[PDB]
Subunit: 462 residues, 4 copies
């Protein structure tokens, strides 16, 4: 063990620990969810602390001898070698101070270990004085979050792109598959299954566009703002140097916000992302709702498509296969919706120079990106690639519908077309049967008029 | 045209009008929605103003000669005679102050007209000094709201009880109608259409209970609170008497809240009501969603039930009958959900002694109650009562299903039961026909195992 | 008092009414809010019908003698001459069918009267056969809504730009007004009032940017899609013409969507507009919360700014000036939040080829735009432009604060700073006086260090 | 390593693991959040499994040799020996089948071990045939949830009660502490600080009542419903016995639902709970907001109250004391708001005989209860108990206010009071001074009129 003194007393800390009293105190204050910060935030925090230490040495404010061990220690953090050391709740008071301090202590303590000194020897390397030099909670924390969110978003985009491409392949596969379109859930007129799947592919391409556009406002960073955005006693050179580093290491084209009070007190950039992610899930949920309807059956549903069986569906009926993959998509949607409200509430709660509610906001926005990425990947691997169409059954729906009379009409004139439809609806005979029965059209004439393609695309009938 | 002057200058009030300059300024400040306060709120404002006058006269604060006409004028407001004079926007700043003054001005000017004086002569009858005597915005305004919400709630309750009884009628009507149950939208085991409709009746019964129970907290009013809850300078007798009058004239069992500061600054009683409304609409929405699935077709859908046609259809497209009635239920549900968020955000916005965000809160609360009352009524009279079942289509689903097999499962044993299940998926044939030819159970045993009452009860 | 027979029986339509039984039926079916659709939507419906009449005539589908009057009648609808005649509820089932038919019936009957026949003679001019020719509910309705939203949106942008400029004018006005920054509602370091205001103007600048970019997806219309987006029996030339007519008479650069089925069944374009509106109101509500705090008092509060009085206050309680304008701002913000959830649930509700929940979504979308426009306008003219500062008050928050030691810190070393702050917090003595007390800095140097600009900019 | 089997194929499974093929499949299908279901749900599933086994033996449906061991294995789940073994994501497709099978497999495998048989040997103890006998996912899963929710709800109520009473103590401690009331954030008339705190106590007490009242509907369980609520094949003796065991081991007054179809397909009882949780956090958030304002300062805020410091401040900023405890309450409030929307959305998506969105729902409902319990406890312990009043500073606010003229008014007549009020406002002088300077009341007369109690309570002037 080891001891450290705080304004609240002393704490017995395990020797193997790299956190200190501040982190433990945050543990006592906020035992809220029992979760830890997402590893991408940890890696981002490492980047910030590596960038600050580096920039600080260059302008001679941090001693070159101790700064090198801070850098080396930050790199290990960036590698994810110290994730277990980050113990503070993502839902916490103090506006991210504990998260920042958690990084500061773990970085100072590894830096100390690497130069043969002892953990807790803060007179030599200080979590506050060296590791946190030139920076405030209110710049280090948000900056880390922009990096983390950006990195996570790029991922989402790649995975959403792959899913959208796979939606496009099914449209090609189903390009010629004819079915009944439905409106109000009531039979309408012929549609192609491939047109429904292209419709899914296009809304997603659009989702990809909106999500990507939200990265721009995240690129503006507030490093060098000090407490309130005024940059009081900040060195303009530290600023331009630390941003240049942060951009390189993170691999994002970060820019230093033009007005740092603006970048320090406003949280619109975050609500922008959530909104785009919400719109996306809305569309995904709807698509998932269609897939579950098309897979309904096997006998008292619609049975248009077959989903790859992904686990036994019933614990007392060995047979039936539920659409579990689309089901989990729906549940992620409802999650993202709920997260969006929490983010909306947190953003509006900002006061004067700081929004103290960012911890809960950042936990929800990170959660949404991650869980969307996750279901997206899983759903495309385990469902979307293997979806198969029941072409024969969907064809039978077409031959038996009243809707085909819409393609037949212009060839037969309005009066008789309506009498054929009325007769077919009431007797349960197909329109074809009646057209041939009353000698109104031939078997050959109807075969050309009921062409799957001409029925589902514009064009003058004659 | 007449002249009233203001700390912002002169405004001309049309001679036909009973509002004064204060109300006009409200208009210019808050031209937000173009809507006007609910007629039930107007009545309630009247009740509040009449109860107040009567108390102030009894306790000798209001001159008996002027108060007599104030009461008379307030009574006309209660009676709906002056609805068009209430012109301020339900979405407004000033924490309802404009609403209060709108009632005050109208009642002042009508009282003056009644005693042969000139409208606008606030020397003789003042909107603040008389009509608002012993009152604050912060008691009169929430008190009328409590009264109005309560009255609207009781009307919702009666409408919902009626609707619930019409569901339970349909449950009895479909008591013996067998159909295939669906979980995950995947065929399960048989169920009775009447059983689903009982499920509906029962969930609604629970909604009625939840809704009615939210009334109790509204019965506590803050009349007499003055600005914050302290009641500075108020007569304890004025408080005692005005509460009595408020209950008598409103027909609600109102109670003077036990801690006036609590009643003046907290707004939990409205969120409690909105929550119960929201829960009800969730259930309603789910039910409407089902209704629309059951009516889907007539060839490429489930076609289990028929809903009365409420659209003119198409003469080219017979059989297409859109479920417009459940559709409107869904959209009301979606509004209520939204209304509830607005109510929540407005409630959390309270600060110290007053929650000034009440004007938007109340407008949304009132909207919710009102719009559910209206769909509940229209849905009931134009859809629910007339729903018919397609018995053959449904019976046909049972006979041609695999699910039928868990019902004749320990009559043949598990031996040739998986032979009867792994072949019934293969051949695409019914299980009734695979029992009369194999010989494991003959016609007479299949006759009662597949009874519309046998396989749907433990 | 005319008579019209419905598949449900005879209804008596008033002498001077231009609607018909179909509209009346919607009235019976859906007496939900007692509201009417927005006039811009009425105007946009008229544009849809006028464009359709012109295309149908050119393409040879509509008789030109009859069509000539349909156009005339539609123009009157556009000029807003028949807003009274649009009586259906914006919360309605049937996926906008009755809104469409309300337009169809009004235009038919007014066309009839223009050509001197009796209203209701739908053998001559049919709401269905003529006024709704080559159209479905499922393309005419959305296209009207797209045009209506876009017009309203352009007003909102114009209004928001104005408000944003007035914020920027206030930032320049206050550019030299020193005050104490607060984080966690706790005294922090000094900040200019002008800087806070610049932060309001820039967030609104971004809101405008966001809101404006949402117009693009709305430009893609589905006119010609017919029932499901297949365009079954549709003449491509009709589709092509009607689109170009819609762009011209609406003022928007409308384009025929690339995939009509997609355009017919997806609703992402509306939630996109909603989301951007919601984000704007979050920022506006936050700003109004600050204004209300800044104006608190006048004795037991922050009392940093004076808002123009807008509510009459009592002679007996002067000083009490309630910030009603930011208050209304806050409530429109709350309104928009809930509208946005309604919009989300409506959109998620879509099934297969059509989302039937659009009326409640469109009602909500239009409300949001409409109430934002009106509250921005009133707030700008009745609060923002007339804001004043209490310079002296804020100036002495700074002088009397501990926070100011941050500006002094690197000039006197960290250790002396902490000794000075400690005495400051103990005795109440100003940090300025303490430095002179101990001769650690001269009056000269305090004037250079505690300079308003010097404390609030990098260095 | 080991090899297992189900209706879809084979999987490899670690030898030390107690879960099986069906669980491991779910981990592949739903790698969504990386969270695990709540301890209390694991406990409750054990109660379901133990009760059903006991009921199956007494009916002569389950072999007593094998059944004896299932019970013993189930008790160890109840004691929490095997939590590490429940690995399925709380956000999952299949409507809880995975959570149900996770328990079924863990219990079967441990039951085998106990009787000296091999793990995975389902020929001897089947997770489907033995452990899940007579029950479905669609009763076992929601029944374990009702029980779990009830036990967490009882704990919350208890903690909330404790909090409320601490607020009541504060109200008493501050009963005579005079301050200025504010409406619109503008100065109004005097109020007692304790009158405010009492108003906080009373809204919480109503919250307790609401939350507690949501329990009634959760007492009705659907055990014996099989797949759809029809109790197909299920034996009336079993239902009666199992219902009786569930109540005894759960400690709750559980009842068999009157209409099992209703209880199987309806979800109102969960949204009812969520709603009560939301209303509460609305109130809690407001109180927190008032607290953070009251704590504002120390020189440019309101400085009405002092919160126990829970955060080390720098020696450069003494007196800056961030209200970290109320801040976390606010963020928990926003979390709960979001969770309620997720819950509304999931409950709405029910279809026919089952709502398959229960997993995301249940996860958010358990999250809301738990995180409220946790902040409530921490907040009272690390903030509420230690709040002190700035009596002096608040008295000064009262004396320098304009609103005291409302008390003085009746003793003076309207017009003299008005004049004094206006002159006090414009000159910045105290109403008290102007009263003497002009001789409208004496020093002693004013001390009578400005009595802290008589100003903040109803009563005629004289
Ligand atoms: N959730 C399954 C039942 C089960 O797994 O026991 C179904 O309803 O299909
Ligand atoms: Ca029938
Ligand atoms: Ca000035």
């Amino acid at each position: 063990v080891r001891i450290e003194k705080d304004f609240l007393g002393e704490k017995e800390i395990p020797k193997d620990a790299y956190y200190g009293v501040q982190t433990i105190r945050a543990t006592e204050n906020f035992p809220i969810t029992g979760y830890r910060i997402h590893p991408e935030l940890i890696k981002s925090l490492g980047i910030v602390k590596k960038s600050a230490a580096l920039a600080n040495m260059e302008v001679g404010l941090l001693d070159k001898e101790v700064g090198q061990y801070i850098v080396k220690a930050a790199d290990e953090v960036i590698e994810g070698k110290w994730n277990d050391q980050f113990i503070v709740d993502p839902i916490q008071g103090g506006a991210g101070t504990s998260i920042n301090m958690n990084a500061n202590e773990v970085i100072a303590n590894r830096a100390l270990e690497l130069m043969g000194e002892e953990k807790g020897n803060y007179s030599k390397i200080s979590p506050n004085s060296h590791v946190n030099m030139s920076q405030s909670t209110n710049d280090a924390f948000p900056t880390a979050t922009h990096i983390a969110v950006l990195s996570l978003l790029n991922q989402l985009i790649e995975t959403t792109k792959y899913m959208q491409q796979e939606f496009m392949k099914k449209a090609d596969e189903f390009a010629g598959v004819i079915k009944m379109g439905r409106t109000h859930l009531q039979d309408a007129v012929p549609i192609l299954l491939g047109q429904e799947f292209e419709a899914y592919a296009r809304v997603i391409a659009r989702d990809i566009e909106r999500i990507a556009n939200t990265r721009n406002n995240l690129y503006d960073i507030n490093m060098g703002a000090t407490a309130v955005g005024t940059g009081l006693n900040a060195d303009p050179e530290y600023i331009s140097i630390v941003t240049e580093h942060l951009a390189k290491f993170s691999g994002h084209p970060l820019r230093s916000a033009q007005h740092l009070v603006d970048a320090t007190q406003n949280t619109d950039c975050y609500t922008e992302v959530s909104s785009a992610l919400k719109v996306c899930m809305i569309n995904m949920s709807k698509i998932a709702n269609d897939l579950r309807l098309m897979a309904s059956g096997p006998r008292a549903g619609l049975s248009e498509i077959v989903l790859p069986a992904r686990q036994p569906g019933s614990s007392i009926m060995p047979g039936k296969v539920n659409p579990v993959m689309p089901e989990v998509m729906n549940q992620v949607a409802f999650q993202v919706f709920g997260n969006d409200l929490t983010i909306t509430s947190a953003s509006e709660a900002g006061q004067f120079e700081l929004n103290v509610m960012e911890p809960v906001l950042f936990f929800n926005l990170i959660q949404s990106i991650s869980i969307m990425t996750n279901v997206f990947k899983s759903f495309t691997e385990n469902c979307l690639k293997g979806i198969k169409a029941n072409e024969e059954r969907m064809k039978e729906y077409v031959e038996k519908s009243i809707g085909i009379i819409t393609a037949i009409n212009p060839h037969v004139g309005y009066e008789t077309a309506a009498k054929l439809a009325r007769e077919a609806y009431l007797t349960g005979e197909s329109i074809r049967e009646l057209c041939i029965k009353y000698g109104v059209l031939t078997e050959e004439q109807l075969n050309e008029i009921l062409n799957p393609y001409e029925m589902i695309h514009p064009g003058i009938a004659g």
